[PDB]
Design a protein around this ligand. Structure first.
Ligand SMILES: *[C@@H]1O[C@H](CO)[C@@H](O[C@@H]2O[C@H](CO)[C@@H](O[C@@H]3O[C@H](CO[C@H]4O[C@H](CO)[C@@H](O)[C@H](O)[C@@H]4O)[C@@H](O)[C@H](O[C@H]4O[C@H](CO)[C@@H](O)[C@H](O)[C@@H]4O[C@H]4O[C@H](CO)[C@@H](O)[C@H](O)[C@@H]4O[C@H]4O[C@H](CO)[C@@H](O)[C@H](O)[C@@H]4O)[C@@H]3O)[C@H](O)[C@H]2NC(C)=O)[C@H](O)[C@H]1NC(C)=O
Ligand SMILES: *[C@@H]1O[C@H](CO)[C@@H](O[C@@H]2O[C@H](CO)[C@@H](O[C@@H]3O[C@H](CO[C@H]4O[C@H](CO)[C@@H](O)[C@H](O)[C@@H]4O)[C@@H](O)[C@H](O[C@H]4O[C@H](CO)[C@@H](O)[C@H](O)[C@@H]4O[C@H]4O[C@H](CO)[C@@H](O)[C@H](O)[C@@H]4O[C@H]4O[C@H](CO)[C@@H](O)[C@H](O)[C@@H]4O)[C@@H]3O)[C@H](O)[C@H]2NC(C)=O)[C@H](O)[C@H]1NC(C)=O
Ligand SMILES: *[C@@H]1O[C@H](CO)[C@@H](O[C@@H]2O[C@H](CO)[C@@H](O[C@@H]3O[C@H](CO[C@H]4O[C@H](CO)[C@@H](O)[C@H](O)[C@@H]4O)[C@@H](O)[C@H](O[C@H]4O[C@H](CO)[C@@H](O)[C@H](O)[C@@H]4O[C@H]4O[C@H](CO)[C@@H](O)[C@H](O)[C@@H]4O[C@H]4O[C@H](CO)[C@@H](O)[C@H](O)[C@@H]4O)[C@@H]3O)[C@H](O)[C@H]2NC(C)=O)[C@H](O)[C@H]1NC(C)=O
Ligand SMILES: *[C@@H]1O[C@H](CO)[C@@H](O[C@@H]2O[C@H](CO)[C@@H](O[C@@H]3O[C@H](CO[C@H]4O[C@H](CO)[C@@H](O)[C@H](O)[C@@H]4O)[C@@H](O)[C@H](O[C@H]4O[C@H](CO)[C@@H](O)[C@H](O)[C@@H]4O[C@H]4O[C@H](CO)[C@@H](O)[C@H](O)[C@@H]4O[C@H]4O[C@H](CO)[C@@H](O)[C@H](O)[C@@H]4O)[C@@H]3O)[C@H](O)[C@H]2NC(C)=O)[C@H](O)[C@H]1NC(C)=O
Ligand SMILES: *[C@@H]1O[C@H](CO)[C@@H](O[C@@H]2O[C@H](CO)[C@@H](O)[C@H](O)[C@H]2NC(C)=O)[C@H](O)[C@H]1NC(C)=O
Ligand SMILES: *[C@@H]1O[C@H](CO)[C@@H](O[C@@H]2O[C@H](CO)[C@@H](O)[C@H](O)[C@H]2NC(C)=O)[C@H](O)[C@H]1NC(C)=O
Ligand code: DAN
Ligand code: DAN
Ligand code: DAN
Ligand code: DAN
Ligand code: NAG
Ligand code: CA
Ligand code: CA
Ligand code: CA
Ligand code: CA
Ligand code: CA
Lengths: 388, 388, 388, 388
């Protein structure tokens, strides 16, 4: 109809309720479920769907051997009905590639997939299911993007890309698309020293992205975008409650404009909702591996370098595997506020479970409630032994 | 379009004709059919579909081992086309959880799923396929609901929930929802001493629910709801034709306001159509187990404590497994009256058939006919030996 | 929109072109294809689909054992996209039962399924996918119907049913339905001595049905219906070109008003297009079994007791299995005439191929061409040995 | 809506970006994927889909044995969602046959399938999913057509057919259809000596077809059609950059009006975009087999007999199997020009990989970019050893 505008603020997050879970690995043990990773969720005005990067093979298929690798010519961004598993028969291909983002602007959807060899990748921007724009690698070192939904405002949908080193300074760019065409792009500015895999959400005409500093930071870089002025800023979440993985133990004071040190060249895609006292941070429970997952209410985390938790909710037990996590919201829901949502990628197989030769995942997702709901843990649920 | 209003009375039930049967277990022996239980049927203005609680695994899948359990993080309310089986590829997830209800109000559908640990469950009310309201457990003991469709009138859709003991007094509540929001809720009143799994239907602006007294009653509790005044009453079916399971042998006089004794802490979800002389009761044939199923015309069963059958129809032979049963009607059909319908859950596997490690079911459903039709029996049809 | 009216005459049939073929048995050797029999084709204003009676199990499934039987509680009328196979995932259940018919009246579709024990069967008439009318057995001996599409004219859709003996006089009735309700029914009149499984088509406000005399006739009975007056007549195809199976060898003179003798208590569903010189008869090539299939142009077959072929076309070689055949036309096609079409059921398995324990079929269908096209034979294509 | 008119010219081709890839063989190793060959892509105003000739069996199915053969009664033209594999459950049959073409005219789609024995084949032209016209073989020797999409202009959709010898002069005809009816047909004229499997595209009211001279030419014949005048011309691509396969090594001067000699009675379906300096030729890398694939920018290839490459892009490495290739464009895309696209059939199995008894393929397709994008190679990706 008309382009969606981020006119509402976030609903008050008093807890998280179960939104979707596909139990893909469990079901895939005996049905045609595609091997995936880097999943996310994204809504259209009339439907919300699961998204992920297929590996172009089923889990039980012999070609599942080797799927621990991130980039091949057999990957593609696929979407499928909410809470169903990604099957060969119900998965809709959005585009071909090994890194992606996607978002609906209110009229139609834009999907972006990057493909290529490490030194010669290119992104192709699809809009209304047709290819419209292409962007060649600018740093010749694994052009890559969000791995979760982008956000639009009055037709303008900003997207963060990074090209260059994962263990040193790289060239991050913010592109402002409208109907799949480039209106403008900026180099990263602000104090964030390294950016990768931004998780974004929008409220009151501002887009907030919680990303990952793979190079040096255990605290997360944050990019705030003004989609009208098409400008942005960057800093780190000040809070001592560190949210990347692996990471050192939490200090009593964090860092607002530099990566919090202790762990180099590694990390995991994550997210947060930074809204004053209505601030919630997600993170793995383990400081060493992609294990467990919890939500922590940390009032003013973005700006308070001594902020600590005032409430919390466990999503996945530390005795269960987690993985990537990101933000999305149904911008077309009823009501006066936007209900914060997120998903957690539940990785199974390699490298942690090496008795099988594949790597895949399932998805679990929650949205906020103004109630103070009881909590449950949500594991993948599959028994690896069954796949042996 | 406009909210549906219960303006018609029930059609005269002279017999029951076959409406739907999915033969899920038979078909699932060699195709990707999800393990389920607690099924039901519910109509939209343009389509009627089967519903059930998936166990998040196929029947042949190795994860089917252990599905005798009722509550896990891998269950979800799913719906699928009438008479098809619930397959991985055609099942649409309505919400995540281990207890549910769902109903269309004429404009859109409301679905409710409860999830959580036993002492910290919560219900989330979805409307127009989006989460709208959440209700935290109030008695911290397995918050649970109908396991069959709710009914709406002018946008108001009452739903019965129970939280607390299954073997002693519990806290039952009647919630009146409109567009997924809570208009009001009441504590259970009347003479019903324990309520669980209500099967409801509506006619002439009144909603009748036949539930189950798990604690003490072998006769069924009945809740009658006025969806305009948003008030209700409760009592038991007076009739000596006892309809819970297990149960003692039929007496010559029943009980109108107390549970009929003889069997404690057990029962099965069931239903009835209480409409004066046009009254029909469903029940298992066996008084000891979920075996067989029959419909008995018992004029004035609700109010006559000596009422006995005047007609009957066998649905499932006592030599075949049955299970839960419930009511639904197509409120959007043509004609001057509402055609009473019901389904019977045909449970296969554990605990009765323990040579397999799973528990699932198939569905059979009938609707009334003004004709006096010949009868057939409708078993699940699968051979357990094939699964060994 | 508006009810369809049979305003056109038949197109001139100069040959037959390939219309659809699902290769169900071939494909079903390694995919989830349902076991079926008694198939047919029927069109809606916007789509034409394959129909058949499922056996409630896949071909490879262990429950395929025993599918040679005609009536069980696991059968149902299903439809699926033209030329696809009937799979668990794409088959839409129209109704439950073991004998059926279905037709679109221009506004919506009417489907009829009969179920029950032999002595207590009943038909339920669905319209706009909802049950509307029920008819109890009148002779208590396998109430049964067409097994191919019915035809409508201005909302009136006549259907032929038979109840009673298959080897002696039975009670055949012609029901005239409108919106699933009974307007009127007649007992069979005319000279046809026994009627079963009528194949019908309509042109210029008249409905012609070529049926089968199971009791005594090797020539086919024909019922011509006036859907406005709601009256009919019956006789036999006069032609010496005999079209039932099994049958004796062709004589030089046929019978117009009595069954042509030589074979009792047996037969196969078949069809014909009786249109003066534009008359074509279908039949198995073998006089002993459901083997092979050919179309023969026999000018004035209905009324000329010495009529013999003037042209022909082989559909299935005598070295391949055939089965039932019936008529259908796309009444919503463009042009000035109705294009005659038919299907042939290609039966595989029992009783002819007893190395497997199942019985199923695939479908092949053709429509007429005003051209004189070259001919090909169209076998099922599956190798039974593969199923061993 | 209205018939589409070829009002735009081609976009400038500076490189090729990835458009679609189904990884069918990889996925089909463990899911119900149909065996195919002769694939292509074609767009409707609201969707673009993959097309191919099914072999009526899955790859893992026992009936895959023997699929190296081109013509059987079990083949059919099927289409399925872009980049999904052709599965039993998602493939839509367009028509029955072993040679095809299909194109949308802006209002609806026309599909053509040819079937029959070698000496008695016939084509049936479907429009709006209904059979409308039939054409009997005129030379009684494998009537055959494009194997890729046709193109329409103001309702007129020309199609090239060939009937007769593959190793000597044959009878090629250009049919001009409108709404599935024949407006006119011409015999081939011009200097092309033999025509088969034309790959066509349209721009500025002209339709260009790059075909194959199986008899004698290693350069490709080209037919240019005026769809308004319903006339055409024919010649060969003048360029010394030879594009058929097998072929001799490239000379320094080609042939404009005769086949370039060196290889007889063989070839592969291919294509090109002939647009002055914006000219690109596709071809296998190997001169001996269907191995590898590359795009070469050869300015004025059609008319310059000494034209050589000025730019290039590898699509498939010479160490990977290729096959047929053809042209298509989304005529309903936004913008001022038509974006050239093509697909490459990636053949697996026989005859090159004879350890398996089947022959199938997967699809990869690209479209042009005005950017100078980095290149990647796109192999089928399946491991034959897994199928052993
Ligand atoms: C039914 O459901 C309800 C609803 O969920 C249940 O109630 C919930 O119960 C939760 C568990 O108790 C509770 O969650 C905790 O909340 C704490 C905040 O509340 C408390 O403090 C505030 C502020 O003073 C008070 O107002 C309030 O009254 C409470 O006293 C959080 O602090 C908790 O998180 C910390 O603990 C968990 C372990 O439980 C860690 O995983 C987590 O990371 C936090 O601790 C780490 O991080 C902090 C900050 O840096 C460190 O200081 C601390 O030492 C820990 O650091 C180590 O561990 C991390 C992580 O591994 C590592 O990185 C670091 O290096 C160190 O090694 C927790 O979030 C809910 O808020 C509460 N909800 C409600 C509405 O009540 C109820 O129990 C259920 N009923 C039953 C019967 O089960
Ligand atoms: C073709 O199709 C037609 C249509 O279906 C067939 O006709 C039907 O035939 C049915 C079977 O006969 C018949 O069903 C029965 O109807 C009885 C009521 O009718 C009779 O009584 C009335 C009232 O006086 C008369 O007007 C009428 O003319 C008849 O005489 C019911 O009473 C029957 O139910 C009882 O019996 C069955 C066993 O058959 C039990 O399963 C059932 O539970 C009922 O009996 C138990 O319960 C009562 C009440 O408390 C007890 O008194 C009794 O002792 C039994 O109790 C024990 O068993 C229960 C259950 O296990 C247990 O809980 C308890 O503790 C005890 O242990 C039955 O419903 C249809 O009405 C009839 N329909 C029509 C339209 O005619 C026709 O036969 C078919 N043709 C062929 C050729 O097959
Ligand atoms: C390319 O394609 C074209 C198009 O299809 C091919 O041309 C077609 O060729 C067909 C085969 O020749 C031909 O079909 C036959 O047509 C005959 C009618 O035409 C002839 O007679 C007329 C009338 O005088 C002439 O005008 C005309 O010019 C011809 O001379 C039919 O009579 C044929 O059917 C009979 O034979 C077949 C066996 O071929 C039987 O299966 C069939 O049942 C018919 O014969 C039985 O029945 C009759 C009637 O009672 C009996 O008299 C006879 O003895 C047989 O009876 C026995 O068998 C039956 C069946 O088993 C059994 O029940 C009975 O008891 C007995 O045991 C046949 O239909 C097409 O018309 C023709 N089409 C065109 C447009 O030309 C061309 O060949 C192809 N090219 C190549 C290179 O292959
Ligand atoms: C990142 O991505 C970018 C973008 O893709 C990469 O840059 C691309 O690099 C490509 C590879 O170098 C390049 O492709 C070549 O382009 C040549 C044309 O450009 C050159 O000449 C022009 C004209 O003078 C200059 O303007 C220009 O500056 C260049 O100097 C083509 O000529 C190339 O094709 C020929 O070579 C390949 C092998 O590489 C053959 O497969 C191909 O068939 C061509 O050669 C055969 O055919 C010709 C013509 O008849 C014969 O003369 C020749 O001898 C060969 O013949 C044999 O082989 C054929 C085929 O088997 C057989 O039939 C025959 O009988 C003989 O046996 C090639 O197309 C892209 O244009 C370039 N793109 C851009 C925008 O720059 C970049 O490298 C990537 N980065 C990294 C780090 O990898
Ligand atoms: C059910 O009853 C309500 C009246 O209570 C109907 O509601 C009215 O509908 C019309 C048409 O939309 C409006 O003009 C009225 O204001 C509506 N509501 C009320 C609450 O007054 C409703 O249309 C009825 N449903 C149907 C299917 O007729
Ligand atoms: C089939 O014939 C009937 C006439 O018998 C047509 O019915 C009339 O349709 C128009 C338009 O809906 C109405 O105004 C008349 O009252 C209708 N019916 C009768 C019974 O008079 C019908 O439209 C015809 N079908 C088509 C497709 O033209
Ligand atoms: C484009 C790409 O390769 N992204 C990969 C990403 C990347 O390697 C890291 O961000 C350092 O740049 O790492 C991971 C990961 O699970 O850790 C998965 C992604 O597939
Ligand atoms: C929420 C829940 O657990 N419901 C379970 C219900 C419950 O245990 C009983 O009603 C006593 O409360 O019992 C049964 C049952 O087949 O008997 C199945 C349900 O899954
Ligand atoms: C309702 C029913 O049973 N129809 C059966 C029919 C019937 O037995 C015969 O018409 C004598 O009445 O026979 C056959 C058959 O392949 O021969 C199949 C049908 O399933
Ligand atoms: C109608 C038909 O058979 N076409 C076949 C075609 C043909 O044989 C050749 O064009 C000589 O005429 O060859 C090939 C091929 O892979 O080479 C595949 C096609 O299936
Ligand atoms: C099929 O059923 C028959 C009859 O019960 C049995 O003897 C036979 O062995 C079965 N065959 C198979 C393969 O199950
Ligand atoms: Ca880091
Ligand atoms: Ca399978
Ligand atoms: Ca009880
Ligand atoms: Ca007979
Ligand atoms: Ca050649």
């Amino acid at each position: 109809r008309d382009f969606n505008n981020l006119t509402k603020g976030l609903c008050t997050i008093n807890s998280w309720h179960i939104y979707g879970k596909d139990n893909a690995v469990r079901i895939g043990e005996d049905s045609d479920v595609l091997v995936t990773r880097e999943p996310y969720v994204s809504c259209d005005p009339d439907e919300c769907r699961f998204y992920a990067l297929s590996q172009g093979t089923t889990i039980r298929g012999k070609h599942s051997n080797g799927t621990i690798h991130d980039r091949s010519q057999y990957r593609a961004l696929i979407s499928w009905p909410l809470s169903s598993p990604p099957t060969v028969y119900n998965s809709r291909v959005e585009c071909i590639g090994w890194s992606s983002t996607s978002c609906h602007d209110g009229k139609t959807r834009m999907s972006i997939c990057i493909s290529g060899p490490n030194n010669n990748a290119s992104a192709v921007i699809w809009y209304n299911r047709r290819p419209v724009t292409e962007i060649n690698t600018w740093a010749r070192n694994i052009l890559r993007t969000q791995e979760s939904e982008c956000v639009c405002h009055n037709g303008v949908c900003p997207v963060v890309f990074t090209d260059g080193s994962a263990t040193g300074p790289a060239e991050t760019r913010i592109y402002y698309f409208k109907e799949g065409k480039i209106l403008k792009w900026e180099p990263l500015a602000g104090t964030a020293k390294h950016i990768e895999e931004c998780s974004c959400y929008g409220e009151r005409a501002e887009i907030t992205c919680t990303c990952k500093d793979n190079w040096q930071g255990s605290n997360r870089p944050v990019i705030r975008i003004d989609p009208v002025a098409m400008t942005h800023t960057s800093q780190y979440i000040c809070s001592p409650v560190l949210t990347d993985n692996p990471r050192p133990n939490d200090p009593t004071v964090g860092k607002c404009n530099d990566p919090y040190p202790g762990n180099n060249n590694n990390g995991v895609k994550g997210f947060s909702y930074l809204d004053g006292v209505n601030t919630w941070l997600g993170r793995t429970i383990s400081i060493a591996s992609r294990s467990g997952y919890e939500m922590l209410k940390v009032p003013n985390a973005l700006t308070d370098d001594k902020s600590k938790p005032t409430q919390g909710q466990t999503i996945v037990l530390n005795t269960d595997w987690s993985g990537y996590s990101g933000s999305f919201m149904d911008y077309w829901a009823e009501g006066e506020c936007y209900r914060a949502c997120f998903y957690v990628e539940l990785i199974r197989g390699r490298p942690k479970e090496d008795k099988v030769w594949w790597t895949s995942n399932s998805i679990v997702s929650m949205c906020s409630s103004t109630e103070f709901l009881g909590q449950w843990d949500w594991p993948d649920g599959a028994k690896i032994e069954y796949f042996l």
